Design an enzyme around this catalytic site. Structure first.
Site, mmCIF file in Angstrom:
data_model
loop_
_atom_site.group_PDB
_atom_site.id
_atom_site.type_symbol
_atom_site.label_atom_id
_atom_site.label_comp_id
_atom_site.label_asym_id
_atom_site.label_seq_id
_atom_site.Cartn_x
_atom_site.Cartn_y
_atom_site.Cartn_z
ATOM 1 N N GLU A 1 17.505 -27.560 40.403
ATOM 2 C CA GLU A 1 18.017 -28.579 41.814
ATOM 3 C C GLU A 1 18.633 -29.782 41.479
ATOM 4 O O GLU A 1 18.120 -30.808 41.718
ATOM 5 C CB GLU A 1 16.965 -28.726 42.634
ATOM 6 C CG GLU A 1 16.426 -27.238 43.112
ATOM 7 C CD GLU A 1 15.248 -27.332 44.289
ATOM 8 O OE1 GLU A 1 14.205 -27.672 43.707
ATOM 9 O OE2 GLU A 1 15.384 -26.953 45.290
ATOM 10 N N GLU B 1 13.743 -18.015 42.368
ATOM 11 C CA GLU B 1 12.441 -18.418 42.942
ATOM 12 C C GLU B 1 12.633 -17.370 44.160
ATOM 13 O O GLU B 1 13.643 -17.378 44.528
ATOM 14 C CB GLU B 1 12.376 -19.573 43.472
ATOM 15 C CG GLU B 1 12.154 -20.667 42.395
ATOM 16 C CD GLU B 1 12.417 -22.127 42.615
ATOM 17 O OE1 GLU B 1 12.625 -22.982 42.013
ATOM 18 O OE2 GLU B 1 11.848 -22.522 43.792
#
Ligand code: NA
Ligand code: NA
Ligand code: NA
Ligand code: NA
Lengths: 409, 204
Positions: free
Chosen positions: A256, A332
């Site tokens: 991220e 994820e």
């Protein structure tokens, strides 16, 4: 914060082994391999120096080879006088996998031709090829089905200090619960982790300690060349340290931090230096040019989440977007926070039916709860804000399949 | 626009289409069709025929058309609907989510079909939603997927009109007849009625 990992002291001779890379390449059906070990030295070069590389399977010597330093001509100025590549034939190697983690031992000796040993280094070798082909991630030629989990380094008592007991415990539970893979969310792990994954058999995604999520927009630093250097060291130093571990099958550029030009550069660097493993990265949309694998986080099965710039398509639909051909493995998925995992079987059904849906890494292994003591010295599980920390994210630090003590949820 | 070639009754289905000795007769069915119809704008896709398996004759004719008229894609469903003779994956009766893995010629869920390793073509069913008698159950399912997936570009329902024929009872009153009603046998009974409308064009 602190000195949270081991401190050690290493003595090396002046003329020494400064680096070594081990590569294993195979014939079409995996019945023959060549073990290639490139060895680099530092210190005084002499004609009498030699490198011997030997390969063992347990107590049996499979192969061995020696040469003096001096690598082939690289360019107009010649070659590396301080390096040497030994090539060893392996007939019928026992292949490494998470199903059967067969390992060999490679021993690297630096010594004189009269036979005096200067020093020896070594590593565990797992014969296995990782490659993406025709849209699929293959291991020894077969398409992987990743039953993965994300796992941060966390101990309810020791915080971020990892010990071998804890690591073993994690691994055993994972294996006992049909996991065959782990993602190092989101930084390189304590060295022993890899060694264990090698030996017990788990596929690993090694990831650069780069996460800049709180920037606005997310790629603020990653698209800024002034930050390329800092990022570069996080990626290159990881690869230089972890590249001989068979358990690592994929490298990740981080977590991220949007998608910036620094990413593309690093992506290429790795492809260039270690072609043996695919490079993935979810930032900027999960399918940018900095990833060999579509690796979204929390993309749903059938339901699209068409956010601007970085939509999360249904994973089934994602695979077939115009022009898309890559494999898809969720970095994820199935956020196991509290009473969760509702709809887990829906991912599995999709994974099994669609070839290019190769699985995923559940988020995540263990709750990041910390122990506190009450007025009577009775211990209790604390979370965000419990230490007076503010601002904080309260219980969002507890998303695992197991409690911080390893008891299962 | 589809060439007049269908050899379904053969065993295996490509017995003729894979045989060079039948290439001249197939060739005419295709080339004469292109020569007559190529200037029509409504024609946007050429079809090599229907249920004829997949034979080399198909490959040849696919190529010929491509050479002669590059302006339109060529599709052909025979042999598995995704052979080297079609520019479009064009299955018949493939379901939305459910796979039908027949050997050799499976019918994959269409959503899954699209992303098979190495596949990149669009998918348009040449036939889907068999409107035989009280039917069309599950139709919305198709639409929902066609809308969600770019490469799912629709299909052609099977089919428009019931092939029923008119007969008259002794009293001169007419009624719709189907297979067998003419003393025709063997016959396939009601299988000739699969339309969205009755033969007289009254809708179902
Ligand atoms: Na799959
Ligand atoms: Na969290
Ligand atoms: Na569509
Ligand atoms: Na019919």
């Amino acid at each position: 914060s602190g000195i949270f990992r081991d401190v050690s002291l290493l003595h090396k001779p002046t003329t020494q082994i400064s680096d070594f890379h081990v590569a294993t390449r195979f014939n079409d059906d995996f019945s023959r391999a060549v073990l290639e070990a490139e060895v680099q030295m530092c210190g005084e070069l002499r004609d009498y120096l030699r490198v011997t590389v030997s390969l063992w399977q347990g107590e049996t010597q499979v192969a061995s080879g020696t040469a003096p330093f001096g690598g082939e001509i690289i360019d107009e100025r010649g070659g590396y006088a301080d390096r040497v590549t030994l090539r060893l034939n392996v007939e019928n190697p026992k292949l490494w996998s998470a199903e059967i983690p067969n390992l060999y031992r490679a021993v690297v000796e630096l010594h004189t031709a009269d036979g005096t040993l200067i020093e020896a280094e070594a590593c565990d070798v797992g014969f296995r090829e990782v490659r993406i082909e025709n849209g699929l991630l293959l291991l020894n030629g077969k398409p992987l089905l990743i039953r993965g989990v994300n796992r941060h380094e966390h101990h309810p008592l020791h915080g971020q200090v990892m010990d071998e007991q804890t690591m073993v415990q994690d691994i055993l539970l994972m294996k006992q619960n049909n996991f065959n893979a782990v993602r190092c969310s989101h930084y390189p792990n304590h060295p022993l982790w890899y060694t264990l994954c090698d030996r017990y058999g788990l596929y690993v995604v090694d990831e650069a300690n780069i996460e800049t999520e709180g920037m606005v927009p997310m790629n603020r630093l990653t698209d800024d060349p002034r930050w390329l250097p800092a990022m570069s060291e996080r990626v290159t130093r990881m690869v230089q340290r972890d590249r001989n571990h068979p358990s690592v099958i994929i490298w990740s550029l981080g977590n991220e931090s949007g998608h910036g030009a620094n990413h593309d550069a690093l992506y290429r660097w790795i492809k260039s230096v270690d072609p043996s493993r695919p490079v993935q990265y979810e930032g900027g949309g999960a399918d940018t040019t900095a990833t060999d694998i579509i690796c979204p986080m929390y993309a749903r099965v059938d339901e699209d989440q068409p956010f601007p710039a970085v939509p999360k398509w249904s994973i089934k639909k994602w695979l077939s977007l115009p022009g898309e051909t890559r494999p898809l493995i969720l970095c994820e998925y199935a956020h196991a926070m509290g009473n969760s995992l509702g709809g887990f079987a829906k991912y599995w059904q999709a994974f099994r039916q669609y070839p290019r849906l190769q699985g995923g890494f559940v988020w995540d292994w263990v709750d990041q709860s910390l122990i506190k003591y009450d007025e009577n010295g009775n211990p209790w599980s604390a979370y965000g804000g419990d230490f007076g920390d503010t601002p904080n994210d309260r219980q969002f630090c507890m998303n695992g399949l197991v409690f911080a003590d390893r008891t299962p949820h």
